[PDB]
Amino acid sequence: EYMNAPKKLPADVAEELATTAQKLVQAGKGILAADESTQTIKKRFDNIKLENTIENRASYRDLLFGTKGLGKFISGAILFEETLFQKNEAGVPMVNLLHNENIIPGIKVDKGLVNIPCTDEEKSTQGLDGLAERCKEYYKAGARFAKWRTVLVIDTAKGKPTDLSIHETAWGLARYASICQQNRLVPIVEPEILADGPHSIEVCAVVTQKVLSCVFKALQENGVLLEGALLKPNMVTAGYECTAKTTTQDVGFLTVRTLRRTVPPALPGVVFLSGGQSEEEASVNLNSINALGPHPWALTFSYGRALQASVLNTWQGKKENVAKAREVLLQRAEANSLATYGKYKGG
Amino acid sequence: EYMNAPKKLPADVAEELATTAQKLVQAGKGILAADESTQTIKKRFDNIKLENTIENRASYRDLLFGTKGLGKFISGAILFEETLFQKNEAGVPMVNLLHNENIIPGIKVDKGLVNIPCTDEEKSTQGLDGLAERCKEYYKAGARFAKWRTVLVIDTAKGKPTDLSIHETAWGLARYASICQQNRLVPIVEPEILADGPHSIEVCAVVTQKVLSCVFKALQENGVLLEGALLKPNMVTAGYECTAKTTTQDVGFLTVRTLRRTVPPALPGVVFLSGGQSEEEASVNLNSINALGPHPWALTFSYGRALQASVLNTWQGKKENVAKAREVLLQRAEANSLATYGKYKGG
């Protein structure tokens, strides 16, 4: 045996991880990102003028997961730690609501971001300490895949992202993914590059290509099974303050090119994040990406903003608007579902 | 601009490299490896008791390239520097026999192997000195793609291949390819891992994955256009002196799996080397590789032994056998062409 190489995973474990990974990116289905933290979900309730109580958080997530027919467009839903062990009004656990709708429970395992020393406020993600213990807890709770968000910044003037930022991101994601696979959880690798700045779309492509190269490099050195993993990157787009006008096909082209240059086909799929994009543009861009013919991997979505923004506005924390808001959730879910086939018209 | 990143190739140059890369791996076609050195071609004339002279070498390459209908199966032909400027007994340039058959001329551009210091006779490939100058001359001679052969050895007891062996191989390949693309030559990256040893096929799969992961990492760092590049790796097989019996399906599966984990879809094709395999083994194995459904890249062949073995014996260094030998070439060329379809079934 070669010895100086990451040892193989047990056949049973690797087999289950491959099944879950492919099932999460099943044809026409995507992932619902409803794993907002307490302070994160707070800023959402504030916009619709709603108090951030434990009853409201439970009620809201109950509205999402209790949506009859959501399983047609959603393969999996990422939960926060609280939601995973939470029950609604009727007494039914939130996990059981997903089980009835063929939706695979997911869990956010990262402990937030922390500045890297000797850098210009470039972030690093914490959550490795006791991660294996939490994975065993989450699995028995019903979770079958995990998530871990890292953040990179594009600032060419300041040379961002620096090598230290890129490698800490890559190695951090690397360690996380190996631990999850060890404990029967499919890791969603999220090296999110912020679209904040005036940089062009060409710059974003070069940076994303460089980051993804280092991410997968770190992934293979820790011996992470690509067949049992997923990637959650940002769409290759121009900066938010960029002046050079870019069409949706420009987004789709430079995104597909970036992925084909960096992502091995062993990866069953790629779940894009909406980011700061509007609900409609998140669907249009995802459509533009999938309009470029059948890809080696499934290019679907792991949206949260693009699926919940209009839902919250319709619901407004009132029971009389639940069914009304649930239909808003379904039409957005169907919109991004058609986007996976490249058959989503503007309206 | 991100600055800290390998610059892009000029639009015109990168475009020519891409279309050339596409033509070399056309559907149902592969590459004829006729780039034997004057010493390697000597041992082949020792099996047919023929004088290793420039006249016999001329007549032999003429037999191969003068074959009509060969273009239907052969998309490109790799040549030694001697043959690139050589003429047949009739006075017709060898490069013109390829042009008439629409076969793309190729050139072996490495200067051989040397020992790496502080290693147990691990090989390093030379040929970087004045490589840019030679590529310009080869391009004006008709060559459109180049070849660089590196060698790695599997020995688990000695930890072979060591990290120094792997990195020097990867960095050398990346250096050569960036220069070729700069000089309008499609680089064929050949990280050949020898099948010598008693190691199992699982060990070969592990090593190959580690090597390819290191190889492609080097290509990115050197900013090499994968769209205009070729990979020439070994088939994932067990060692010759191994005792664990494996079928052609085992070779097919563990080869595909390895490539899917390491080789990005941007790479348009993968040309396998025949190695020590027989003419029938190379065809059946290539068939087994392509029998495993459609692939993100073209999984064809770059054979030399598997195409010229029966041709040599049939020729026997005689003009009256030229017509008979060329048909043997076509029979085997078509045999591997069907293998690329995954429909080759000898018998």
Binding site: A291, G293 | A18, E227
Partner: peptide, 10 residues
């Protein structure tokens, strides 16, 4: 056979 991207690529 292949994706639309590959067709429009070269």
């Amino acid at each position: 056979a292949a994706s639309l991207y590959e067709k429009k690529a070269a």
